[PDB]
Amino acid sequence: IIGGEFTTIENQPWFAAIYRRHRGGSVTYVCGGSLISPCWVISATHCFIDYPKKEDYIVYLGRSRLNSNTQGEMKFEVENLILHKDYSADTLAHHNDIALLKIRSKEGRCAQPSRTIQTIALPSMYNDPQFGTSCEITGFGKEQSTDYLYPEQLKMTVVKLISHRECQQPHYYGSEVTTKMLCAADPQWKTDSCQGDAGGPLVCSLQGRMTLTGIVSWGRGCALKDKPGVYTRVSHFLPWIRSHT
Numbered sequence: 001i002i003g004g005e006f007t008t009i010e011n012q013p014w015f016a017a018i019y020r021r022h023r024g025g026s027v028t029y030v031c032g033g034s035l036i037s038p039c040w041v042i043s044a045t046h047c048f049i050d051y052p053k054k055e056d057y058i059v060y061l062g063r064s065r066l067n068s069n070t071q072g073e074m075k076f077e078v079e080n081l082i083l084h085k086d087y088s089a090d091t092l093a094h095h096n097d098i099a100l101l102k103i104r105s106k107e108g109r110c111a112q113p114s115r116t117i118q119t120i121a122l123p124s125m126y127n128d129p130q131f132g133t134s135c136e137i138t139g140f141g142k143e144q145s146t147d148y149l150y151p152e153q154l155k156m157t158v159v160k161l162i163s164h165r166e167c168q169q170p171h172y173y174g175s176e177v178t179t180k181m182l183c184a185a186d187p188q189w190k191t192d193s194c195q196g197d198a199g200g201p202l203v204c205s206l207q208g209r210m211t212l213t214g215i216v217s218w219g220r221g222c223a224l225k226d227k228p229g230v231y232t233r234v235s236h237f238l239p240w241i242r243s244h245t
């Protein structure tokens with residue numbers, strides 16, 4: 001995350017930190033995700049497309065720090081890694097960039113809500129909020145596009161939903177952005193998601209409820225003028241989600 005503020009998992013208790021075991025024993029961070037039901041985390045396909053082997057992945061819930069323990073965290077294995085059949089990546093755009101991780105503990109259990117762990121609601125079919133709405137994003141991604149390391153503490157920030165009208169302008173993204181995506185940026189272009197934040201939540205208030213409206217996907221650079229963050233439009237994938245769940 002570029003700009004914004006450090007936070008803790010209590011303020012984003014649906015946030016799932018996803019890691020990969022390295023054959024040869026080193027574990028590194030992959031991507032964020034969101035707990036949409038006790039047994040299910042949603043994230044982005046492109047996080048996993050290069051190594052689609054469920055056994056190699058670990059999901060943490062209740063975690064506020066990248067490489068150190070948070071009291072109240074819970075570790076899960078991936079019982080099922082479901083990637084989207086029609087995923088594709090072009091020059092920039094990633095299409096159908098959505099994934100599901102069915103999680104279970106070694107002890108056979110799914111997630112249990114606590115002070116640091118709660119589920120997030122899905123939006124209703126095709127129901128988004130209006131352009132101009134303020135939403136929050138969260139993740140362990142880079143604080144600067146140029147950085148070589150990720151921050152050790154979870155960050156979040158606030159961005160605004162942009163109209164497809166605006167995002168499609170040729171000086172923005174033009175054709176690469178579709179109606180299965182959503183653009184969000186700072187009006188002054190000072191804060192954004194970045195490399196390391198993929199799979200994480202874009203969370204907006206919808207009917208009195210914090211709802212998972214988008215999944216961090218792609219952008220050109222991070223926090224660049226006229227290049228908003230692009231997010232998978234959750235409200236357009238409910239049947240996929242419901243089928244595969």
Ligand SMILES: N=C(N)NCCC[C@H](NC(=O)CNC(=O)[C@H]1CCC(=O)N1)C(=O)Nc1ccc(N(O)O)cc1
Binds near residue numbers: 193220
């Ligand atoms: N909001 C803005 N402005 N940008 C969003 C960046 C999210 C980021 N997504 C991507 O990198 C997808 N690819 C890109 O964004 C390309 C296009 C622009 C660029 O410079 N790189 C991420 O964390 N990606 C990511 C990709 C792969 C992996 N591993 O797991 O495979 C992990 C993270």
